[PDB]
Write a protein that binds this DNA or RNA. Sequence first.
RNA 1: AGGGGAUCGAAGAUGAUCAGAUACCGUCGUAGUCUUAACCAUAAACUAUGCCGACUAGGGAUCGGGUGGUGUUUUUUUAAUGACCCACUCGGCACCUUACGAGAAAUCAAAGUCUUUGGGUUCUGGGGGGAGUAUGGUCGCAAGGCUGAAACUUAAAGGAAUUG
Lengths: 25, 121, 81, 96, 206, 216, 97, 129, 87
Amino acid sequence: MRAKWRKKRTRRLKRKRRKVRARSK
Amino acid sequence: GRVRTKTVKRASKALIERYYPKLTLDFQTNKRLCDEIATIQSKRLRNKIAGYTTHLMKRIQKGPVRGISFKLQEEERERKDQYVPEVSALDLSRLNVDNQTSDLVKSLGLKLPLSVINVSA
Amino acid sequence: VLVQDLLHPTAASEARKHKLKTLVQGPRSYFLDVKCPGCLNITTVFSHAQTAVTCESCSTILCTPTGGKAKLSEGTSFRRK
Amino acid sequence: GKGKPRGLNSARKLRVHRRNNRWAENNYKKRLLGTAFKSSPFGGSSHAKGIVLEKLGIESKQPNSAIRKCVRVQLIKNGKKVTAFVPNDGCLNFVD
Amino acid sequence: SLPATFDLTPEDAQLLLAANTHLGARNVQVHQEPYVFNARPDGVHVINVGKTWEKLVLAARIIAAIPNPEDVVAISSRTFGQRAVLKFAAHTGATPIAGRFTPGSFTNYITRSFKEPRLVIVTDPRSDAQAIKEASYVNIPVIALTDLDSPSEFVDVAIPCNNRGKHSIGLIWYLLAREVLRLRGALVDRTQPWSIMPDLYFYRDP
Amino acid sequence: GWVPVTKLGRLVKAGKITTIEEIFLHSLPVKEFQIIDTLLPGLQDEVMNIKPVQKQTRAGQRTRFKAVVVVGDSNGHVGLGIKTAKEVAGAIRAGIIIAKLSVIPIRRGYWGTNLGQPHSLATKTTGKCGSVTVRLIPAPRGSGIVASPAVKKLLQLAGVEDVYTQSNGKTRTLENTLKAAFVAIGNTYGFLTPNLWAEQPLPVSPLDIYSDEASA
Amino acid sequence: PKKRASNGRNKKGRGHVKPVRCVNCSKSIPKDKAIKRMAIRNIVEAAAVRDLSEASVYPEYALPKTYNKLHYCVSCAIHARIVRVRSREDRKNRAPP
Amino acid sequence: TRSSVLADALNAINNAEKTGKRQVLIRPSSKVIIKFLQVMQKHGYIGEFEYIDDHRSGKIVVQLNGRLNKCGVISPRFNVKIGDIEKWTANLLPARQFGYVILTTSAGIMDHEEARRKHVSGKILGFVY
Amino acid sequence: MENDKGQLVELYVPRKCSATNRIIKADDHASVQINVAKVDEEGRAIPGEYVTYALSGYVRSRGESDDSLNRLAQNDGLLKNVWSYSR
RNA sequence: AGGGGAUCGAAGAUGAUCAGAUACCGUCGUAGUCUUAACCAUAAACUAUGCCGACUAGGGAUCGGGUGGUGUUUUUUUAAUGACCCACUCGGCACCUUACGAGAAAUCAAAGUCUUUGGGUUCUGGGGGGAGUAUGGUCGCAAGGCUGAAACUUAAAGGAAUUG
Ligand SMILES: [Mg+2]
Ligand SMILES: [Mg+2]
Ligand SMILES: [Mg+2]
Ligand SMILES: [Mg+2]
Ligand SMILES: [Mg+2]
Ligand SMILES: [Mg+2]
Ligand SMILES: [Mg+2]
Ligand SMILES: [Mg+2]
Ligand SMILES: [Mg+2]
Ligand SMILES: [Mg+2]
Ligand SMILES: [Mg+2]
Ligand SMILES: [Mg+2]
Ligand SMILES: [Mg+2]
Ligand SMILES: [Mg+2]
């Protein structure tokens, strides 16, 4: 896939992981 | 299309190159001497060659042709080539030269007449 | 060119060249002995002066500065020195 | 000037620059991080003894159609599970 | 050196200044050409006809050093010089090439236009660039009639002239042939004016 | 029969030129391999590799073969020829021809102590073709040729007994390695040395001495 | 690889050139990279001028012209039978016909 | 900025010799440049040269024959011992028969053969051949 | 060059350019050897009496052969004011 | 966060087209686009070419400054100017031709003066992926930025050109 959209996907994933970890932190 | 091939054109060029004080603007006698003076296997090709020779002779009757050269043409060319006037235009008719040229002559140290005129910008 | 004398060039070429880029660099500027009308009292004036020079006798005006050479006034007589 | 310093008192720069750019290698990195001793089911050893658990019919990669007659092995010193290939015609019948 | 009979005579100077050989190019100037004398207004540069004559005599000596005159070759793709090179070939040996050069004439040992000369003479090195290029492949010197803006590369003796002109080219060829014949011994009289007129080597539109 | 069409060919057939040294001295261009076959009758050919080269077409791949040939007598002369042809034999024939045409001299010399019969090169030399640079360094006696097989064979046919080699690039391109080595050993007579500082009187060429035994 | 030394345009020594809009597709394109043409045209035609002159009061008059400077993007210019496409060698030709 | 004037001098000489010129102008004329050129002259690699005394630093106009293939500079001026001389000469000369590595010793600037004769070593400046 | 006891080796001591004193390689086909005829007492040329000047491909390619030959001829006496040392 | 808010317009709503079309096309349209005071610190932020310095080929044009010329024109025929022309020069933005040279080539007056390897100096890379990911720090209101692995996997990925 286009690298821009791979980057956008990775960023949305990093955000969701940040919050699912804030659940426990 | 009625475009001739290089066999026909080369054969006609050669026939003109060495049989000009000869064959004329008539396809019939040009054919009847083509079969006399060349070895051609087929009547069709003979007649094509004769037609192209007639066409080229019609061309030659009005000026020269590029690619062709026969002895009469060569002699005319060299005769015109040896032309010279009797005045030798470089010869003096009255010579003009600018101030820089007068300076050049003076530098070389030579006796010459000069009709100096000024060169303006 | 592949062969030339770089020690004895032509004065034409050296005057064509920039002052620093000559064989020995030196100034293309000069000084002038200037006479103002009236008070003789000649004044020494540099060609590229940078100042509105005027004679000590009176404040007439001798040269006005420019980006390069100074412009000497209309009524004045100068002598390259 | 080709980058790198050439000065006669510029050796420390060259040393530490080499250290970093050596970490850029592969063999140096594996040797110094100690991956063999810390990973790599052996202990950086040449050989290792283990106990057979299961026989396997691993299918080959393409382009190749075959079954390669391997075995699962629990290593004695580490306890790690490992797949090993039994090389020859019919030698799986000695590894019961 | 020379016996001083070869210096520039007022007759030759009359010819050269009447043909306006001394009129060089405009402000354009190849720095390989120091043959200039005190540029005119109008931006036109004047040529040292004395240096022209000296280089011309040098080229004549080079030519006359060739034992077999047929090994000399004269090139002119311009129309203003074909009669000149042909009459040059008439009076000297000087195997001529007027019109087209036929690439592969000094290389390509099989073709029918194959010359293997010891010297080639050229009327304009920009229009005859194929010839000098192919001479740089096979160890051949090149004499050339240059203006002040011509490309000096792969050019040996350069005769400064006005190659823009009809009369200048023919005059330079005429003088060259005259000096060659004098050095060879046909013209026993160095002072004689060589009955052949200069306007023989001149272009005609008819 | 040969029937040469060249000034040089006519002179060589008449026997006026008995050595290629005159050809090399006057930088004369050769265009007939029979000249080299006449002057250097003792040189041997060697075929290095035959690689096929393919041209894609509407109807499949049109293939022809590239042959690299090194010719040489083992006293001072080598030539390299590379030819493509539809058939391997013809490739090799025409490559031998081109190699003979491409013959150059080799300036052999001493590592030191000029005892006798030079064995090495006189100078460090390099040649480059493509990415490949081949460097030849002079070596002492007994070192032999320290090189890969192909450059070793070229140098054997050139007559170099002792030489080191440093190399760089994709040396698996044998055409470029051989051409780099060829340029390197051709540069030996380009490098100026103090034993060549002496000025000589610029001799006269056979093409001007034997002018009538030439063209006609 | 690189195709052009100007890369597409006429920006040597600027940095930024303040785009314009294409006349057909409204695309934003830098002004230096744009294609500029100038479409000068008599108002009516070369055909109707006879009728206009015959039906006109004020003889001799002028029949003035219309002037507009056209900016096309690359895509529109190539589609509209303008700067179409050229060989690697003639790409360097910087002059008009 | 300008650090080694000798390097600029020898670069200019190298480029002139590559271009076939028979002369070159050096600025700004250091003492080590003078002694270096004197060595090259004593061994026959350049020819005459002339120091133009402007009151700043000097210029030099060198005459060049065609005998010079490469005159070079070794920067930094490494400290060189009596066997490192041999190591260098191997590395950076074409042959064991000609060419000179040049080194500033306490006994003046010289070539490495003279340095072997006088039995002294020093700092390496450059090379010529 | 030579071995321990004279006995010249190095076949083909090569030619050097008259302008740059650089060696003319065998594969340098842009090299030329100009022969200028001598004259004696009348203006006629002597056959077989030449003044020779070799020029290499580099000089011939940079466009400096004309100037080099000018100065070489002026030095050897068969020319005059054409060439100047000061440019 | 205030102001401002015409235009265009991520979202969104709609009309079509389409097998579908929550896309391209069309009509509306919030945020934004503007501004003030703060934040963010990223980009194909590109000449994809670090800065300083020297040398090495020709050609002409152009921007700025300066010099010279009985030069042209305008003024008050005239002066000084100013604007032009010619020649020259310093410093720039660039351009044309060639390759001595360089380069894998495309191409390059620098990407040259590099196996004939050293003018000074900073930064970065070491097969492809995983991965600019995980984790830890630090900055940030946040969005995110800076720093930054490993396991594991793989024989090819990739550059420039060539004929199809
Ligand atoms: Mg230091
Ligand atoms: Mg596979
Ligand atoms: Mg390698
Ligand atoms: Mg593309
Ligand atoms: Mg930008
Ligand atoms: Mg970035
Ligand atoms: Mg970047
Ligand atoms: Mg620089
Ligand atoms: Mg200016
Ligand atoms: Mg400028
Ligand atoms: Mg600017
Ligand atoms: Mg690696
Ligand atoms: Mg990697
Ligand atoms: Mg590609």
